[PDB]
Amino acid sequence: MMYPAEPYRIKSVETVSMIPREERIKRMREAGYNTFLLNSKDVYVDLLTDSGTNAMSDKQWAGMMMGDEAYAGSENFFHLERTVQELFGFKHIVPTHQGRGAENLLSSLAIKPGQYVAGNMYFTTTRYHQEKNGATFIDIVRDEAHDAGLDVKFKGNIDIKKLEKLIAEKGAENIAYICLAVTVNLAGGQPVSMANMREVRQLCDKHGIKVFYDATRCVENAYFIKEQEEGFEDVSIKDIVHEMFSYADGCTMSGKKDCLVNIGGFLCMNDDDMFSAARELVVVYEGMPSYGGLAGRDMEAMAIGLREAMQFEYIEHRVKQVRYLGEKLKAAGVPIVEPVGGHAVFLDARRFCPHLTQDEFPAQSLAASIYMETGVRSMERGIISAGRNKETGDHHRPKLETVRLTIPRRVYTYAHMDLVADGIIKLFKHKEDIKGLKFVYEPKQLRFFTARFDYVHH
Template identity: 80%
Template sequence: MDISKYPAEPFRIKSVETVKMISKEEREKVIKEAGYNTFLIDSEDVYIDLLTDSGTNAMSDKQWAGMMQGDEAYAGSKNFKHLEETVREVFGFPYLVPTHQGRGAENLLSKIAIKPGQYVPGNMYFTTTRYHQEANGGIFVDIIRDEAHDAGLDIPFKGDIDLNKLEKLIEEKGAENIAYVCLAVTVNLAGGQPVSMANMKAVRELTKKHGIKVFYDATRCVENAYFIKEQEEGYKDKSIQEIVKEMFSYSDGATMSGKKDGIVNIGGFLALRDEDLFLEAKELVVVFEGMPSYGGMTGRDMEALAIGLKESMQFEYIQHRILQVRYLGEKLKEAGVPIIEPVGGHAVFLDARRFCPHLDQEEFPAQALAANLYVESGVRSMERGIVSAGRDINTGENHKPKLETVRLTIPRRVYTYRHMDLVADAVINLYKHKEDIKGLRFVYEPKQLRFFTARFEEI
């Protein structure tokens, strides 16, 4: 591997958190007590935590300083005004409704934009997004390009919407029966795959012709912008800020979890262009989140998010962020470990189907792989496969996604390249004795979003 391709961290470390490595025997006991669910492991028993990049970021000195200026007024906080101004500047949306995190925004959008029985096409489902859509009577339809479901196919912009699928859905169901198009940038469960600017433009043109709105999941939009700058013709010399602004010019609004590309530990928002939808969202946010000027966030957290959004536009920051993830992916590829290709923006996804070919999908190979990786190394990861996909709300049968993966999710500004080396070594060592990984079965299965709290036992 050519290490010169990977820039050093564009920051200095000012504060540290001590972590410890417990013994393998202790980890075997921990995972069994956790029901082989990595979500149920105590943080203090984890050595390198790659469960998620959501809210696990390291904030900057400017963000911490901003938190000391929190205006915790119940209404009319100055920090809300700063966040509102920042969202207008960065994304171009005139209206902002803050929420406690991204799923709060998903709930609001689903309630104001979906009529029961309407279809919500999107470029691959996400767990909480689909839950809110279905809970409000929507019917999710996957219209991502077919190539996104092929883990080993290394092509750019696998997150693109298939325009033929979208047009066919409109023709079959009628434009009036399409609530809106949900466009995620990037696509998490496809492996953090980006969407091209050309595809965003084309989706906007098609939906405009039929009077259909388009809402983005903006959670990792800065990562998406980097891929556009790196790989799409005509954007090499544009700034990240310019690319982000253009991306969202093709949408009617967006939900965002600030806990990812906002580089904070909590917070999110719903941003809109339509004033009528905004007024509806303002009424509902009082019921579910809080006053429209804080929406479940403290003043200090709104300030940190406003500053974090600006910091995420810095090229040096996002370049290091993307390439650190790519570094881990390339190390695993060189060792022959099967992963989703190309490496996406926020995580490396192990392809559990090829990693554990001896396990049937109903034996939850990705869940088993994540559990065994923890025992092997103290590294915590997350299942993104049949367990996360849940059950069909009508038939009760398991959804069986083509992608059965384990997500190694890299928090922002937290770990170094040496940490990535340790993770790579652990995965490679586990791959050498992958046949020892046993399948799992449910001991406890909750009805909703089961991957968070389900418990398993080895078969």
Template identity: 60%
Template sequence: MTELNLPSYSIETELGNSRSDSAPVPDAISTIPVAQPAPDDKPARPHRRRSWAEPYKIKVVEPLKITTRAERERAIAEAGYNTFLLRSEDVYIDLLTDSGTAAMSDYQWAGMMMGDESYAGSKNFYNLEEKIQKYYGYSYIIPTHQGRGAENILSQILIKPGDYVPGNMYFTTTRLHQELAGGTFVDVIIDEAHDPASLHPFKGNIDLQKLTDTIDRVGAARIPYISVAGTVNMAGGQPMSMANMREVYQIAQRYGIRIILDATRAVENAYFIQQREADYHHQTIAAILREFCAYTDGCTMSGKKDALVNIGGWLALNDPELYEEASNLVVIYEGLHTYGGMAGRDMEAMARGIEESVQDEHIRARVGQVEYLGQKLIDWKIPVVVPIGGHAIYLDAKAFLPHIPQDYFPAQRLAAELYLEAGIRTMERGIVSAGRNKETGDHYYPNLELVRLTIPRRVYTQAHMDLTAEAVEEVYYNRDRLEGLMMIHEPKYLRFFQARFALKSPVS
């Protein structure tokens, strides 16, 4: 691989923000100098750091239900030890996902009242289209009910049986759509992404040698596109550098292959570029996002993440012929090409959410809250994926529960125990999520066996993060008491959503 010219990076965070020493620090959270002028009767103030706070205030609250241990034991048993099958009313702090769980702003709620629910040609669609074109830079926009709707349409128009899709680590729904269309996903992410302890600042990078080797092996004609995610969810929310994106683009141009971006958390990726690549310290998030997308030919998007809404997504393309084909398919699977499965009010909320998502103070606080929780766990020597990612903390279940073999689903067991301990719902990202090889029927055994603590945007307070950290520490202290699980029900597709488990003692 080409060696990147990256700034120095430390896993230690500064007031919730990973930054290089040369990065600008906003006035509101700047450090106080070691020695300041002081009156004669006062000693000089010691060196310290000021606290930072979220750039919003709370206007509406939702009461939470606090359950007893006995109630949680019944609930998790009824759910087959699968946190997806818990009732939300039985959950205290819900860190299952950041998908569709954000708190919308007063600006977005006001937009909801301006929904144009016309079946065709809603004005809200044109508002959404304008915002995507402005901030992401793509020419043609096809709204969908959420990201997987866009993945389905993209796979049908581009992938043929026998094709190969190289990418920087799989994502569950993306890979399934590729496989259902007859394609095979090929992981070309750098090796550091599979090491939870590696401090590489851009573990989402594509290994350029792996990519070119794949192209030379299968032939460019059998690669409909290179699948790029920013950030990489299954690697721990790890970002991709602008330098690497640019190099991948140059390879794609040389071979005549498209690049399709999973833009779900591309704003968070832009934040890490701003913090960790020297050339981008003084650029805005909006400018970085626009440049990153310019190295791609289209994107799929779940607006339920970065765009701060509860439902919705889109497929964006620059090729007019592909757009024509996709806009025809959206009518079959989603809805008319000017609403694509969304109400007008939802499109307006998403258009306004896009505006808010690229504001530097918003994304700094969003990632800062994640880093706050992660740093507490690091300080307490609890094994997590480092560097801390943009949307979640990932517990390293292999290191957390080394006595439970991967066949007995240690990450699934750990997620269940966190719920039992404090009513905190998290998600398994390991062998269960990886699924089975469609040819052999054997489990995939990923190197990463993780539990994801996903932080919804603008929802929880610092006190919730403190409680979560304390619950994780308590489970870690008592980890030797935990048994493994056995799977007693397995769905055909995406089994992590609906599989059921029962307690099982580890193999002696």
């Protein structure tokens, strides 16, 4: 099926207030037309992010009642450890409170100053920790990834030629590690093929270079492999996931993404010595290696969730729900990043509002309009989030001016997707009526978080 029904029932609901348009407009204005300043209680469908917003199962909530909150030797730790060892195949695991905790550990252990880290694009926290520990980041993603309109498979693949060029120019000993992300966020949630992981592994093995996965949406990635990589159609998600990680030396994981939980993460590695070093380092940043900044009950929920994520029908429905939204928008001519990724649809607000300039903040304004029209919250990922240039004092002006419709796992229905799509399509049909915004309050940093705007009038 192009669009299968939910492979589960609703056990419990989260009630919402269902406020009318006049009230939404009032709340949007109070939030300075910045969706980051909206109160959760005033949002009907919250597509700000797929991180930590997932609906857990009855089995996970049963696990939540069996939290073994002991500082050492918790049953929940042992369940998590054996689950990750079984499903990912790594020798050692260190729990962390979420993904960027594991990144702090990995980069603190695996990077000497002056070295390079190469990856298929980047994520903000991941890159921060790499650079904080002395590394220069090199993008080695394939060129197609930077063409937002280009519909091609496995857009997230590393260009092996760029990797070969790097090794020759910089020398293997100067490369801390390859950071292979699955899926690739900055490209719109694009997958990486098994063939690509193999080729990166083979080349790195030649030169003694380590590969560490940024694995936050690895199950979504496994689904794309199963659906689209020749030869994998009859291989289980579980076997695809296990094979994927067989080509890595370790990984950083955010449970908040594909482990179907609201908090949690971990660091995996095969190397005994690195594991020992990670154990003493985790103590001062996260907590003892036996809980790593997580309650027992959350290690349990993450262990259960990761195993739940392996179910074909679940991840098929997850990805096809996102696809449904994207295809409905595409059918109406709405400009989106293509192909649709695993976890989100990205609107190109620049092309949605051709009558505006980027300096009138079309992404920020389109996000405001979407909320006022529907009660749906989306995230500005454009000029506002990019922040100001510290030297010039002018805006950074990023090439991507987008509104991100980010889909939590197992929270919404196709009817919610229809509500979102219908509102956006209505706005698109009258796009010329979307007004530009200007600052009325700008913080000196993290401006996307608390900035306030009002409309430009002529």
